[PDB]
Amino acid sequence: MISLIAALAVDRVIGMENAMPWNLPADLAWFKRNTLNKPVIMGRHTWESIGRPLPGRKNIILSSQPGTDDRVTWVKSVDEAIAACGDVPEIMVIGGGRVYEQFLPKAQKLYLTHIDAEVEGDTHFPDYEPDDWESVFSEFHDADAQNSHSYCFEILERR
Ligand SMILES: NC(=O)C1=CN([C@@H]2O[C@H](COP(=O)(O)OP(=O)(O)OC[C@H]3O[C@@H](n4cnc5c(N)ncnc54)[C@H](OP(=O)(O)O)[C@@H]3O)[C@@H](O)[C@H]2O)C=CC1
Ligand SMILES: COc1cc(Cc2cnc(N)nc2N)cc(OC)c1OC
Ligand SMILES: [Cl-]
């Protein structure tokens, strides 16, 4: 079972200049809760944005180039990434844009953070038909001292 987890601003913006154009410690907490002790598949741009391994998860990096960090697992293809996860209940695909594009069709589950922010972006979450998806869980949160935007945590299931 392949799952995507992503945080979407207004207009499906997920990124700008190899970072997320916001600062939502509550989102990173949600991300950590839902990824801990599961394999994570990320693209090389995302790996470099994060800048260090994600503790409690097998870190699988997609890159056509040879690896540059002995602590994580490097793969050269989707099929290799997926085999590198092994026999697990849930594969977590954690970004970015190009990687989401490739796994969304294989994905059974979406973990979305809807962020109330109209921010400039160079990377967007892939388009998809919502007819194909059923909302399972949502949870709304007001902005606070540490989170300048309101947000909603939603889980969706294919059909
Ligand atoms: N809002 C959110 O939830 C999140 C936001 N982001 C944002 O996403 C953006 C980055 O996304 P994007 O630019 O698409 O890049 P990605 O992070 O998806 O990484 C792309 C790179 O991954 C490698 N790669 C991807 N697919 C393959 C494949 N099939 N075979 C081999 N190598 C592959 C390549 O590395 P190489 O070039 O070395 O071959 C490619 O250049 C950033 O702005 C980041 O902040 C990311 C995570 C979460
Ligand atoms: C833990 O820190 C990061 C995590 C992520 C991935 C990510 C973050 N939030 C959500 N909701 N989904 C994701 N896939 C992406 C990041 O930057 C691109 C991070 O660095 C701040
Ligand atoms: Cl690519």
Coordinates of all heavy atoms in Angstrom, one line a residue, residues 111-158:
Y111 N -2.6 11.8 2.7 CA -2.5 12.6 4.0 C -2.2 14.0 3.6 O -1.1 14.3 3.3 CB -1.4 12.1 4.9 CG -1.6 10.7 5.4 CD1 -1.1 9.6 4.6 CD2 -2.1 10.3 6.6 CE1 -1.2 8.3 5.0 CE2 -2.2 9.0 7.0 CZ -1.7 8.0 6.2 OH -1.8 6.7 6.5
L112 N -3.3 14.8 3.5 CA -3.1 16.2 3.0 C -3.2 17.2 4.2 O -4.1 17.0 5.1 CB -4.2 16.5 2.0 CG -4.2 15.6 0.7 CD1 -5.3 16.0 -0.2 CD2 -2.8 15.7 0.1
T113 N -2.4 18.2 4.2 CA -2.5 19.5 5.1 C -2.9 20.6 4.2 O -2.2 21.0 3.3 CB -1.2 19.8 5.8 OG1 -0.8 18.6 6.6 CG2 -1.5 21.0 6.8
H114 N -4.2 21.1 4.3 CA -4.7 22.2 3.5 C -4.4 23.5 4.3 O -4.9 23.6 5.4 CB -6.2 22.1 3.3 CG -6.6 20.9 2.5 ND1 -6.3 20.8 1.2 CD2 -7.2 19.7 2.9 CE1 -6.7 19.6 0.7 NE2 -7.3 18.9 1.8
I115 N -3.4 24.3 3.8 CA -2.9 25.5 4.5 C -3.6 26.7 3.8 O -3.5 26.9 2.6 CB -1.4 25.6 4.3 CG1 -0.7 24.4 4.8 CG2 -0.9 26.9 4.9 CD1 0.8 24.3 4.5
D116 N -4.2 27.5 4.7 CA -4.9 28.8 4.3 C -3.8 29.9 4.0 O -3.6 30.8 4.8 CB -5.8 29.2 5.4 CG -6.8 28.1 5.7 OD1 -7.2 27.5 4.8 OD2 -7.2 28.0 6.9
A117 N -3.1 29.8 2.9 CA -2.0 30.7 2.5 C -2.1 30.9 1.0 O -2.1 29.8 0.3 CB -0.7 30.2 3.0
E118 N -2.1 32.1 0.5 CA -2.0 32.4 -1.0 C -0.6 32.9 -1.1 O -0.3 34.1 -1.0 CB -3.1 33.4 -1.4 CG -3.4 33.4 -2.9 CD -4.7 33.9 -3.4 OE1 -5.4 34.7 -2.7 OE2 -5.1 33.6 -4.6
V119 N 0.3 31.9 -1.4 CA 1.8 32.2 -1.5 C 2.3 31.8 -2.9 O 1.8 30.8 -3.4 CB 2.6 31.4 -0.4 CG1 2.4 32.1 0.9 CG2 2.2 30.0 -0.3
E120 N 3.3 32.6 -3.4 CA 4.0 32.3 -4.7 C 4.7 30.9 -4.6 O 5.3 30.7 -3.5 CB 4.9 33.4 -5.0 CG 5.7 33.3 -6.3 CD 6.5 34.5 -6.7 OE1 5.9 35.6 -6.6 OE2 7.6 34.4 -7.2
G121 N 4.5 30.1 -5.6 CA 5.1 28.7 -5.7 C 5.7 28.4 -7.1 O 5.1 28.9 -8.1
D122 N 6.7 27.6 -7.1 CA 7.3 27.0 -8.4 C 7.0 25.5 -8.4 O 7.4 24.9 -9.4 CB 8.8 27.3 -8.5 CG 9.7 26.7 -7.3 OD1 9.2 25.8 -6.7 OD2 10.8 27.2 -7.1
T123 N 6.4 25.0 -7.4 CA 6.1 23.5 -7.4 C 4.7 23.4 -6.8 O 4.4 24.0 -5.8 CB 7.1 22.7 -6.5 OG1 8.4 23.1 -6.9 CG2 6.9 21.2 -6.8
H124 N 3.9 22.5 -7.5 CA 2.5 22.3 -7.2 C 2.2 20.8 -7.0 O 3.0 20.0 -7.6 CB 1.6 22.9 -8.3 CG 1.8 24.4 -8.5 ND1 0.8 25.3 -8.3 CD2 2.9 25.1 -8.8 CE1 1.2 26.5 -8.5 NE2 2.5 26.5 -8.8
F125 N 1.3 20.4 -6.1 CA 0.8 19.0 -6.0 C 0.2 18.6 -7.4 O -0.5 19.4 -8.0 CB -0.2 18.8 -4.9 CG -0.3 17.4 -4.4 CD1 0.7 16.7 -3.8 CD2 -1.5 16.7 -4.7 CE1 0.5 15.4 -3.4 CE2 -1.6 15.4 -4.3 CZ -0.6 14.7 -3.6
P126 N 0.4 17.3 -7.8 CA -0.1 17.0 -9.1 C -1.7 17.2 -9.1 O -2.3 17.0 -8.1 CB 0.2 15.5 -9.3 CG 1.2 15.2 -8.2 CD 1.1 16.2 -7.2
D127 N -2.2 17.5 -10.3 CA -3.7 17.5 -10.5 C -4.2 16.1 -10.2 O -3.4 15.2 -10.3 CB -4.1 18.0 -11.9 CG -3.4 19.2 -12.5 OD1 -2.4 19.7 -11.8 OD2 -3.8 19.7 -13.5
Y128 N -5.5 16.0 -9.8 CA -6.1 14.6 -9.7 C -7.7 14.8 -9.7 O -8.1 15.9 -9.4 CB -5.6 13.8 -8.5 CG -6.0 14.5 -7.1 CD1 -7.2 14.4 -6.6 CD2 -5.0 15.1 -6.4 CE1 -7.5 15.0 -5.4 CE2 -5.3 15.7 -5.2 CZ -6.5 15.6 -4.7 OH -6.8 16.2 -3.5
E129 N -8.4 13.8 -10.1 CA -9.9 13.8 -10.1 C -10.4 13.4 -8.7 O -10.2 12.3 -8.2 CB -10.4 12.7 -11.1 CG -11.9 12.8 -11.4 CD -12.4 14.2 -11.6 OE1 -12.0 14.9 -12.5 OE2 -13.3 14.6 -10.8
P130 N -11.0 14.3 -7.9 CA -11.5 14.1 -6.6 C -12.7 13.0 -6.6 O -12.9 12.4 -5.6 CB -12.0 15.4 -6.1 CG -11.2 16.4 -6.9 CD -11.2 15.8 -8.3
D131 N -13.4 12.9 -7.7 CA -14.4 11.8 -7.8 C -13.7 10.5 -7.4 O -14.4 9.7 -6.7 CB -14.9 11.8 -9.3 CG -16.3 11.2 -9.4 OD1 -17.1 11.3 -8.4 OD2 -16.7 10.6 -10.5
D132 N -12.4 10.3 -7.7 CA -11.7 9.1 -7.5 C -11.4 8.9 -6.0 O -11.0 7.7 -5.6 CB -10.3 9.1 -8.2 CG -10.3 9.1 -9.7 OD1 -11.2 8.5 -10.3 OD2 -9.3 9.6 -10.2
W133 N -11.7 9.9 -5.1 CA -11.2 9.9 -3.7 C -12.4 10.2 -2.7 O -13.2 11.0 -3.1 CB -10.1 11.0 -3.5 CG -8.9 10.7 -4.3 CD1 -8.5 11.2 -5.5 CD2 -7.8 9.8 -3.8 NE1 -7.2 10.8 -5.8 CE2 -6.8 9.9 -4.8 CE3 -7.6 9.0 -2.7 CZ2 -5.6 9.2 -4.8 CZ3 -6.4 8.3 -2.7 CH2 -5.4 8.4 -3.7
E134 N -12.3 9.5 -1.6 CA -13.3 9.7 -0.5 C -12.6 10.1 0.8 O -11.8 9.4 1.3 CB -14.1 8.3 -0.2 CG -15.2 8.5 0.8 CD -16.0 7.2 1.1 OE1 -16.3 6.5 0.1 OE2 -16.4 7.0 2.2
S135 N -13.1 11.3 1.3 CA -12.6 11.9 2.6 C -13.0 11.0 3.7 O -14.2 10.7 3.9 CB -13.1 13.3 2.7 OG -12.2 14.1 3.4
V136 N -12.0 10.6 4.6 CA -12.1 9.6 5.7 C -12.0 10.3 7.0 O -12.8 9.9 8.0 CB -10.9 8.6 5.6 CG1 -10.8 7.8 6.8 CG2 -11.1 7.7 4.3
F137 N -11.2 11.4 7.2 CA -10.9 12.1 8.4 C -10.5 13.6 8.1 O -9.7 13.7 7.1 CB -9.8 11.4 9.2 CG -9.1 12.2 10.2 CD1 -9.6 12.3 11.5 CD2 -7.9 12.7 9.9 CE1 -8.9 13.1 12.4 CE2 -7.2 13.4 10.9 CZ -7.7 13.6 12.1
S138 N -11.0 14.6 8.8 CA -10.5 15.9 8.7 C -10.4 16.5 10.1 O -11.2 16.1 11.0 CB -11.1 16.8 7.7 OG -12.5 17.1 8.0
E139 N -9.6 17.5 10.3 CA -9.3 18.2 11.6 C -8.8 19.6 11.4 O -7.8 19.7 10.7 CB -8.3 17.3 12.4 CG -7.9 17.8 13.8 CD -6.8 17.0 14.4 OE1 -7.2 16.0 15.0 OE2 -5.7 17.4 14.3
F140 N -9.6 20.6 11.8 CA -9.2 22.0 11.5 C -8.5 22.6 12.7 O -8.7 22.2 13.9 CB -10.5 22.8 11.2 CG -10.3 24.3 11.1 CD1 -9.9 24.9 9.9 CD2 -10.4 25.1 12.3 CE1 -9.6 26.3 9.9 CE2 -10.2 26.5 12.2 CZ -9.8 27.1 11.0
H141 N -7.5 23.5 12.4 CA -6.6 24.2 13.4 C -6.5 25.7 13.0 O -6.1 26.0 11.9 CB -5.3 23.6 13.5 CG -5.3 22.2 14.1 ND1 -5.5 22.0 15.4 CD2 -5.3 21.0 13.5 CE1 -5.6 20.7 15.6 NE2 -5.5 20.0 14.5
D142 N -6.8 26.6 14.0 CA -6.6 28.0 13.9 C -5.1 28.3 13.8 O -4.3 27.6 14.4 CB -7.2 28.8 15.0 CG -8.7 29.1 14.8 OD1 -9.0 29.7 13.7 OD2 -9.5 28.8 15.7
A143 N -4.6 29.4 13.2 CA -3.3 30.0 13.3 C -3.0 30.2 14.8 O -4.0 30.4 15.6 CB -3.1 31.2 12.5
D144 N -1.8 30.2 15.3 CA -1.4 30.5 16.7 C 0.0 31.1 16.6 O 0.4 31.5 15.5 CB -1.4 29.2 17.5 CG -0.4 28.1 17.2 OD1 0.6 28.5 16.7 OD2 -0.7 26.9 17.4
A145 N 0.7 31.3 17.8 CA 2.0 32.1 17.9 C 3.1 31.5 17.0 O 4.0 32.2 16.6 CB 2.4 32.1 19.4
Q146 N 3.0 30.1 16.8 CA 4.1 29.3 16.1 C 3.6 28.9 14.7 O 4.4 28.3 14.0 CB 4.4 28.1 17.0 CG 5.2 28.4 18.2 CD 4.3 29.0 19.3 OE1 4.8 29.9 20.1 NE2 3.1 28.6 19.4
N147 N 2.3 29.2 14.4 CA 1.8 28.8 13.0 C 0.9 30.0 12.5 O -0.2 30.1 12.9 CB 1.0 27.5 13.1 CG 1.8 26.3 13.7 OD1 2.4 25.5 13.0 ND2 1.9 26.3 15.0
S148 N 1.5 30.7 11.5 CA 0.9 32.0 11.1 C -0.3 31.8 10.2 O -1.0 32.8 9.9 CB 1.9 32.8 10.3 OG 2.2 32.2 9.1
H149 N -0.6 30.5 9.8 CA -1.8 30.2 9.0 C -2.6 29.1 9.7 O -2.1 28.3 10.5 CB -1.4 29.7 7.6 CG -0.4 30.6 6.9 ND1 -0.7 31.9 6.6 CD2 0.8 30.3 6.4 CE1 0.3 32.4 6.0 NE2 1.2 31.5 5.8
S150 N -4.0 29.2 9.5 CA -4.9 28.1 9.8 C -4.7 27.0 8.8 O -4.2 27.2 7.7 CB -6.3 28.6 9.7 OG -6.6 29.4 8.6
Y151 N -5.0 25.7 9.2 CA -4.8 24.5 8.3 C -5.8 23.5 8.8 O -6.4 23.6 9.8 CB -3.4 24.1 8.5 CG -2.9 23.9 9.9 CD1 -2.9 22.6 10.5 CD2 -2.5 25.0 10.6 CE1 -2.6 22.5 11.8 CE2 -2.2 24.8 12.0 CZ -2.2 23.6 12.6 OH -1.9 23.5 13.9
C152 N -6.0 22.5 7.9 CA -6.9 21.3 8.0 C -6.1 20.0 7.7 O -5.4 20.1 6.6 CB -8.1 21.5 7.1 SG -9.5 20.4 7.5
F153 N -6.1 19.0 8.6 CA -5.5 17.7 8.3 C -6.6 16.8 7.7 O -7.5 16.5 8.5 CB -4.8 17.1 9.5 CG -3.7 17.9 10.1 CD1 -3.7 18.1 11.5 CD2 -2.7 18.3 9.4 CE1 -2.7 18.8 12.1 CE2 -1.7 19.1 9.9 CZ -1.7 19.3 11.3
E154 N -6.4 16.3 6.5 CA -7.5 15.5 5.8 C -6.8 14.2 5.4 O -5.6 14.2 5.0 CB -8.0 16.3 4.6 CG -9.3 15.6 3.9 CD -9.7 16.2 2.6 OE1 -8.9 16.7 1.8 OE2 -11.0 16.2 2.3
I155 N -7.5 13.0 5.5 CA -7.1 11.7 5.0 C -8.2 11.3 3.9 O -9.3 11.4 4.3 CB -6.9 10.6 6.0 CG1 -6.0 11.1 7.1 CG2 -6.5 9.4 5.4 CD1 -5.9 10.1 8.3
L156 N -7.7 10.9 2.7 CA -8.6 10.5 1.6 C -8.3 9.1 1.2 O -7.1 8.7 1.3 CB -8.4 11.5 0.4 CG -8.7 12.9 0.7 CD1 -7.5 13.8 0.3 CD2 -9.9 13.4 0.0
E157 N -9.3 8.3 0.8 CA -9.1 6.9 0.3 C -9.6 6.8 -1.1 O -10.7 7.3 -1.4 CB -9.7 5.9 1.3 CG -8.8 5.7 2.5 CD -9.3 4.7 3.5 OE1 -10.4 4.1 3.3 OE2 -8.6 4.5 4.5
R158 N -8.8 6.2 -2.0 CA -9.2 5.9 -3.4 C -10.5 5.1 -3.4 O -10.5 4.1 -2.6 CB -8.0 5.1 -4.1 CG -8.2 4.6 -5.5 CD -7.7 5.6 -6.5 NE -6.3 5.8 -6.5 CZ -5.6 6.5 -7.3 NH1 -6.2 7.2 -8.3 NH2 -4.3 6.6 -7.2

